[PDB]
């Protein structure tokens, strides 16, 4: 994954600087597993997840099943985190996800800005902001009717 | 928000106050967005800068940024901005926020969920990228933006 033109040249921009940011960076590596059972370990009981163009999932049960539903149709082939920062229990990630659609085989580099809420080392909230139509039309896989 | 026709519901998952000089400048830039004035907003930007509403192509340089913002303000108005979360690290400011956008050709309004990032150098914006879903905005206001 190439560094975008607008990427910060601060050598520490993409590096974790707190234990919370290190956990989020480990979560980004584990995203390539496409394994909701593995990823659910990072989540607290009182938590939520939402790919913002799609309906949110509240509670650990709904988060795992929502992630598992996405992984039946798409694979996260690579995650490249350009920027990671944090303030007040929220961690922010500006990144590219290489998403591959299983039915069509096409892949696409999706620009994503996400936020992670963490208490006691566990994710109590994860929201990824991006444009869904770009990914749908890129890989020929509609996720929103 | 001082825009009584607008209403921003409190999100269930929602901290929003500035804790650094860079966060304060970004928050002041958010209040100035309701001016819908590219000539006034461009004063916050440095010479070497960029802007991109991520579903749309980016603009590099203070000239292209002012022109891109001016073009957007000819078809839409920023009626209100509420920042639920603001944070910063490595000279980058992140803002989780809803913007009430009103499309001028149709008169329809929409509350757009946005996560944005601001890179600041000596108090001036060197980068502003807002992440959001364009389609849901387009369909709610009947205004294709691509
Ligand atoms: Na960093
Ligand atoms: Na911080």
Residue numbers in the entry:
A (entry chain A): 5 to 149
B (entry chain D): -2 to 11, 17 to 148
Task: Please quote the authors directly.
We report an in silico strategy for the biocatalytic synthesis of chiral N- and O-heterocycles via Baldwin cyclization modes of hydroxy- and amino-substituted epoxides and oxetanes using the limonene epoxide hydrolase from Rhodococcus erythropolis. We turned to cofactor-independent limonene epoxide hydrolases (LEHs) that normally catalyze direct hydrolysis of epoxides by positioning and activating water at the active site. On the basis of the well-documented mechanism of ReLEH, a water molecular is positioned by H-bonds to N55 and Y53 while D132 abstracts a proton from the water, enabling a smooth nucleophilic attack on one of the substrate’s epoxide carbon center. We have rationally engineered the epoxide hydrolase ReLEH with construction of a general platform for Baldwin cyclization reactivity of hydroxy- and amino-epoxides and oxetanes.
Several hits with essentially eliminated WT hydrolytic activity were identified, including variants SZ532 (Y53L/N55P), SZ534 (Y53V/N55P), SZ609 (Y53I/N55A) and SZ611 (Y53F/N55A). Indeed, they enable Baldwin-type cyclization with little formation of undesired 1,2-diols. In the case of the double mutant SZ611 (Y53F/N55A), the formation of Baldwin product 2 is improved from 10% (WT) up to 78% (2:3 = 7.8). Compared to WT, the hydrolysis conversion is largely decreased from 99 to 46%. These results suggest that the substitutions Y53F and N55A of ReLEH can effectively break the water binding network, thereby endowing Baldwin cyclization reactivity. SZ611 assembles into a homodimer structure with four α-helices and five-strand β-sheets in each monomer, forming a cavity that serves as a deep substrate-binding pocket, in which a substituent of substrate 59 or of product 46 can occur without steric repulsion. Two other essential mutations, Y53F and N55A, have well-defined electron density maps that together expand the hydrophobic local space, thereby leading to the preference of intramolecular cyclization reactions.
